[PDB]
Design a protein around this ligand. Structure first.
Ligand SMILES: *C(=O)[C@@H](NC(=O)/C(=N\O[C@@H](COc1ccc(C(=N)N[C@@H]2CCCNC2)cc1)C(=O)O)c1csc(N)n1)C(C)(C)NOS(=O)(=O)O
Length: 403
């Protein structure tokens, strides 16, 4: 008397198989591939984790079946690249979230390491944490597209403007890029991911500017998926800011976001400024959402984000044959247990695709890579192109770019 969980097209993800005659159990056909989102039961058909626990009442007849928003073909290829990229880079964990730009539907949600819900004996209480909703890390350079949007909105800068990116000092702390550049343009600021460029913008604006924009894209706001351990991130509510706090805010200092939240930011970028709620159940279109940023400004920055994936950007590794993509890379220094920064990194690559008319938002988070490279452009960017390349071609998206 236990309902069945399926993906958005009917594929079984949690079935009650009869074993032993009359008595039945619970089988998970995808296994580790979708473990964290799906969860598991006990011997009493009681949900303990994931969708199995969140919908335990609906799945017993207080019995109905539940069509998730996941596409198992997409979940499988997300997991295949994410799992083998955690291993290859010898990382602590890795998370990836794939969201439908037009409906906020979660088409995939994966972590490595994982566990097998068909035989969870020996697996501790960790490794059952859904990293996509429980990990909170500083977003780093991935917020920079929103800084350009705010600057264009507040009239501080115009599309064709050359910024002075020579290093400088704010109070005691100094600001410098990975590679020194005497000057840069807006498209160049995001291309090279210039910490100096965006910090100059953050100082020519009231501190409330970036606070308003980041929130309009969902940061610090709950995701309301209903799952266990779903964290809302740490968000600054400061009444007064320092000059160094405003500057480092433009490249991901002073806030912590879950991978699910960061995927919602890029679904709002790919919708050109429409903010839609996230869903792990198959939705009935339409999903109108709320307009949170002017369309013309987000399209302008979406186009700027293409040069990250083109020769010169810090994300050329993510390129895909025959498609335009608009992405942003990111590297964050991890915070230690004492509250100060250690020598461990979070490698990001977030983006939308295809750039001509984005249909999918994708986020790749690789926690603590230790194998030769540590920054997103070399660690998570090639994973982005592998996943998104598989996504665009599985979903039969018309090729975009002459390549
Ligand atoms: C954006 O996230 C931003 N970085 C930060 O603001 C934060 N930390 O920065 C770390 C330093 O990161 C890098 C160092 C070196 C390289 C690199 N070798 N790049 C080469 C360029 C030419 C082609 N080959 C590769 C890349 C990154 C640090 O902690 O020291 C940060 C923000 S919040 C927080 N806790 N940390 C930059 C530096 C722009 N990373 O962007 S990127 O796209 O990964 O390159």
């Amino acid at each position: 008397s236990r309902g069945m969980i399926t993906d958005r097209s009917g594929r079984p993800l949690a079935v009650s198989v009869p074993v032993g005659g009359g008595e039945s159990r619970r089988y998970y056909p995808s296994g580790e591939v979708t473990a964290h989102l799906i969860g598991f039961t006990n011997v009493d058909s009681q949900g303990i984790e994931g969708v199995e626990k969140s919908f335990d009442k609906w799945l017993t007849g207080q019995a109905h079946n539940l069509a998730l928003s996941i596409d198992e073909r997409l979940q499988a290829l997300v997991y295949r690249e994410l799992n083998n990229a955690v291993a290859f880079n010898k990382a602590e964990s890795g998370s990836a979230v794939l969201v439908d730009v037009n409906t906020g539907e979660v088409l995939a949600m994966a972590n490595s390491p994982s566990y097998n819900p068909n035989n969870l004996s020996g697996t501790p209480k960790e490794a059952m944490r859904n990293r996509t909703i429980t990990d909170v890390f500083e977003p780093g350079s991935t917020v920079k597209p929103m800084v350009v949007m705010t600057a264009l909105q507040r009239g501080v800068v115009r599309e064709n403007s050359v910024l002075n990116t020579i290093p400088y000092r704010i109070n005691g702390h100094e600001i410098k890029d990975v590679a020194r550049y005497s000057e840069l343009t807006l498209t160049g600021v995001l291309q090279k991911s210039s910490n100096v460029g965006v910090s100059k913008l953050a100082l020519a604006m009231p501190s409330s500017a970036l606070v308003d924009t980041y929130s309009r894209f969902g940061l610090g706001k709950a995701t309301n998926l209903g799952l266990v351990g779903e964290r809302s991130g740490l968000y600054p509510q400061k009444q007064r800011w320092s000059d160094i706090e405003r500057a480092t805010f433009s490249f991901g200092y002073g806030l912590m976001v879950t991978p699910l939240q960061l995927a919602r930011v890029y679904a709002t970028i790919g919708s050109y400024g429409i903010y839609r709620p996230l869903s792990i159940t198959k939705v009935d279109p339409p999903v109108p959402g709320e307009r949170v940023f002017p369309e013309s400004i987000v399209r302008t920055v979406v186009h700027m984000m293409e040069s990250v994936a083109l020769p010169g950007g810090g994300g050329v590794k993510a390129a895909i044959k025959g498609y335009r993509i608009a992405i942003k890379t990111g590297t964050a220094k991890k915070v230690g247990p004492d509250g100060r920064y250690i020598n461990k990194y979070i490698a990001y690559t977030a983006g939308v695709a295809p750039a001509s008319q984005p249909r999918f938002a994708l986020v790749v988070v690789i926690n603590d890579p230790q194998a030769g490279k540590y920054y997103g452009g070399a660690v998570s960017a090639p994973v982005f192109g592998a996943i998104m390349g598989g996504v665009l071609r599985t979903m039969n998206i018309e090729p975009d770019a002459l390549t």
